[PDB]
Amino acid sequence: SMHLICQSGDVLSARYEIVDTLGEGAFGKVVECIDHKAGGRHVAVKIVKNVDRYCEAARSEIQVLEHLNTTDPNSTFRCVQMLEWFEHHGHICIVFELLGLSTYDFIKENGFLPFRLDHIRKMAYQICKSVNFLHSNKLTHTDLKPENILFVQSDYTEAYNPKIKRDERTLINPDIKVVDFGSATYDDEHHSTLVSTRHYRAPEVILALGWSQPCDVWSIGCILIEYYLGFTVFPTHDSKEHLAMMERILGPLPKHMIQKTRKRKYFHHDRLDWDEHSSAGRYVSRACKPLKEFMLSQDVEHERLFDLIQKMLEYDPAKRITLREALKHPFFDLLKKS
């Protein structure tokens, strides 16, 4: 199907003319369209694959966004605005306001270089504010990651930069919005055992101990460190290796979580069953190091960020910092009148 109905020049619902593809996924694609009933405004349309799993998630996303856009019509809390939805040759399509590049695509197109710290501060504040708004509404996002944080506009300036010895684009406006509510779950809804893209998955999720709002905070921690480094901090598709990476960076997992998990697979006698002298052992031993060794400067602003990240990456979800608390963290002081 989808190839046949998402091409450039196609008209959806007698209204939206497809210009180009913005992104694609296993869920389907997002295309930029010209809205001919609204004077030519460009919009984004998500065309969802006709697979039950993804239809369910799309119907779900629509319910959630009706709730949020009603609660917050002006988008004070930076959730993307849904404009409408329709069916088109058996595919659910959801129309959104058009935004710029995701934070992932920006990093990628900049050669996997990090953001500047002042931009990270602004973006981090907005992300925390947005997701804390979700948390206030008895929702957990579950799939936060740089692909799901989008710049409102990705206009830019380009300057030669002898630090990188290369030309470089700098964002004008670092404002962002959060997208993708298809996994968002209410406190009183059923909680699936597997959630999150694996690189941003919390230890309570990996160990199947239950999860709720705090698993978003873990994800945000992961995001912030990737903005700082410009690469993914847990580059792996194996759950055991992932846990090994956590140990190398954050230290060993709390005994009480280990004893409690149904996945005794990963462990022997209250410690991770992992051979450091193995090959993957040495991969982890060199791709990963203690959190604070990732710092590129001893300047206090850097230390403030790393303190915050550390608190986000607390193993025990019951002890992990909440976004309410995180928004008062000293790292954000520079954004406030003192």
Ligand SMILES: Nc1ncc2cc3cnccc3cc2n1
């Ligand atoms: N450029 C752009 N603008 C709006 C978007 C909304 C989206 C809503 N859900 C998922 C992905 C999305 C990607 C988007 N990309």
